[PDB]
UniProtKB/Swiss-Prot annotation:
GO MF term (any one): actin binding
Family the entry assigns: Belongs to the CAP family.
Comment text on domains: The C-terminus is responsible for sequestering G-actin. The N-terminus is required for the PIP2 modulation of cap function.
Keywords: Actin-binding, Cell membrane, Membrane
Localization per record: Cell membrane
Name this protein carries in UniProt: Adenylyl cyclase-associated protein
GO biological process, alphabetically ordered: actin filament organization; aggregation involved in sorocarp development; cAMP-mediated signaling; cell-cell adhesion; contractile vacuole organization; establishment or maintenance of cell polarity; mitotic cytokinesis; pinocytosis
Length: 185
């Protein structure tokens, strides 16, 4: 069987953030301002996504109209992520910014059906084109660059497992739930 709507999917998602994203954020600020700024937006998108998962675990699947308003914030941060990287082509951290910008679509797993897991993996494939450049340049020379790459890639790897487990064929909603519309602002 499946887990169904469950506080466990909310808890495990946060465990993924604590494990991979928190140190990622520290490394990011340590690397450079533009990288810290772009990851700061990713974090906001991620936190918004956690809230979406929590709402879905407690609410019935909303109308498509309502479901666009709930992810609008997500889309906005994703947008900022790309703008930052697009305007920093001369940055020595362009590969870092592109690992994220070119895989930001991973956030959209919450509305991809019935293959959200494969969607994140495809996106990870895109970040890796750039994280491989990072490793090629810093493997054995800058462990912080290596650890930055590792936190992100493993975050996406664990995210795919989390999905296969708690939202196999799509974000899990609650048929006997409440109204998502009047969410928890």
């Amino acid at each position: 069987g499946a887990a169904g709507p469950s506080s466990a999917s909310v808890k495990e998602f946060q465990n993924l953030v604590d494990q991979h994203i928190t140190p990622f954020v520290a490394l990011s600020k340590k690397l450079a301002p533009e990288v810290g700024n772009q990851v700061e937006q990713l974090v906001k998108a991620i936190d918004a996504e956690k809230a979406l998962i929590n709402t879905a675990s407690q609410s019935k699947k909303p109308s498509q109209e309502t479901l666009l308003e709930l992810i609008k914030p997500l889309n906005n941060f994703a947008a900022e992520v790309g703008k930052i990287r697009d305007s920093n082509r001369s940055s020595k951290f362009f590969n870092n910014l592109s690992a994220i910008s070119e895989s930001i679509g991973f956030l959209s797993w919450v509305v991809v059906e019935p293959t959200p897991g494969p969607h994140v993996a495809e996106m990870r494939g895109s970040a890796e084109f750039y994280t491989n450049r990072i490793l090629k340049e810093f493997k054995g020379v800058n462990q912080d660059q290596v650890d930055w790459v590792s936190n992100y890639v493993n975050f996406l790897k664990d995210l795919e497992k989390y999905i296969k487990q708690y939202h196999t064929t799509g974000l899990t909603w609650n048929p006997k739930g409440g109204d998502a519309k009047s969410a928890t602002p």
